[PDB]
Structure 1
Amino acid sequence: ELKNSISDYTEAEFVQLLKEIEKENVAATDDVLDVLLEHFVKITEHPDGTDLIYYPSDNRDDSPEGIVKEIKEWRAANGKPGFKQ
């Protein structure tokens, strides 16, 4: 379900949220996609927001796993709670 924070999502669950966004990316319109994106921006708290998805750094894989890795390293470097474990 759409939790409120990263701490409620296991790495696998977050990947499922990313694949849902990938599905809406190819939908006829962005009505649903943009709501899922706002949710993603909200819970990750990363300053670059959606860029993590649409403009991945060249220092990591452009994939659900790479997105989770970057978020994981950033949240750790900033003393914020990580994914559920």
Structure 2
Amino acid sequence: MELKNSISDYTEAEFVQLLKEIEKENVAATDDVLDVLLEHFVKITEHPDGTDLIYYPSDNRDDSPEGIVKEIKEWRAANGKPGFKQG
């Protein structure tokens, strides 16, 4: 799909779309496409937790795409890193 190479090209609605794609590839027969999107999520978010944000959510937030987005925003803003595109 339309994969952006930076978290700031992604609006929140768009990043949430990438999370549903992953969830979709999560139940596909193989992990071929899924493991590719997961390496991208890992690189564009830059969070040290990595895939753990999706498969091992922190008990301090919701286990949902919104809960995931929140943690990325919070960790990115708290570290002085550009956020999600505005528009």
Compute the TM-score of the two structures, normalised by the length of structure 2.
Answer: 0.97
Give the superposition deviation at 1:76.
Answer: 0.2
Alignment partner of 1:23: what SS? helix
Alignment partner of 1:8: what SS? coil
Cα displacement string for residues 18-67 of structure 1 (whole angstroms, at most 9, x for unaligned residues): 00000000000000000000000010000011000000000000000000
Give the superposition deviation at 1:68.
Answer: 0.2
Query: What residue is the counterpart of 1:12 in the other structure?
Result: 13
Give the superposition deviation at 1:12.
Answer: 0.4
User: 2: CA distance between counterparts of 1:37 and 1:19?
Assistant: 12
Structure 1 unmatched ranges of 5 or more: none
Alignment partner of 2:82: what SS? coil
Q: Percent identity?
A: 100
User: 2: CA distance between counterparts of 1:3 and 1:80?
Assistant: 17
Alignment partner of 1:46: what SS? coil
Structure 2 unmatched ranges of 5 or more: none
User: 2: CA distance between counterparts of 1:61 and 1:50?
Assistant: 16
Q: Output the aligned Cα RMSD.
A: 0.4
User: 2: CA distance between counterparts of 1:46 and 1:60?
Assistant: 16
